[PDB]
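Predict the assembly for these two chains.
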Amino acid sequence: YLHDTIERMEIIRNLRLGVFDVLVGINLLREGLDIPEVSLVAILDADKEGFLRSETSLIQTIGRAARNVEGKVIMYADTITDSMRRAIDET
DNA sequence: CATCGTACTGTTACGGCTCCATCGATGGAGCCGTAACAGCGATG
């Protein structure tokens, strides 16, 4: 779980070393937070409107899972929006 | 939450400078007391 960059690099190193298997963050847009071993990312309450749920933010979060050869992105939402439709079409 | 702005203020260690408190003895000479040394006449 992530609550500055000083702790960010330590958390990234711990995740790479296998000390932690999963990571949870309130704002998943900090620079350098991507990892090459991540193969699955989930979006929770994506249907709720918010800045972090915009089309550009969704594309940015989806692009983090492209590092893995078999990386995939899953979504947990019962509703769709125009921004979601555009993001899925582009992907 | 990251980014930006024409050499910043106040309080402590450490080395160098300066002022202030606090702290009988030995040899020479004179004197006294004691020990030591020198220094008529009559007869056979």
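Residues 4, 27, 29-31 of chain A lie near DNA strand B (CB under 10 Å from a C1'). The longest helix of chain A spans residues 5-17.
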